[PDB]
Amino acid sequence: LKTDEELARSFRQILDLSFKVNKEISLQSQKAVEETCESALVRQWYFDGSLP
């Protein structure tokens, strides 16, 4: 009856592990685009549409 609770505690953390791992890789992927494109062109994508 506590193995049921603990399977149900464990998989609800493995879903958190998966989601967290995928943010670690997506931030690493984003950084590579932002350091292979020109920082003036990446600035025009992200910031020149919003600048006072």
Partner: peptide, 12 residues
């Protein structure tokens, strides 16, 4: 944060 503040003169 530091990469882009240094290009905006303002914290992103």
């Amino acid at each position: 944060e530091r990469k882009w503040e240094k290009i905006l003169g303002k914290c992103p």
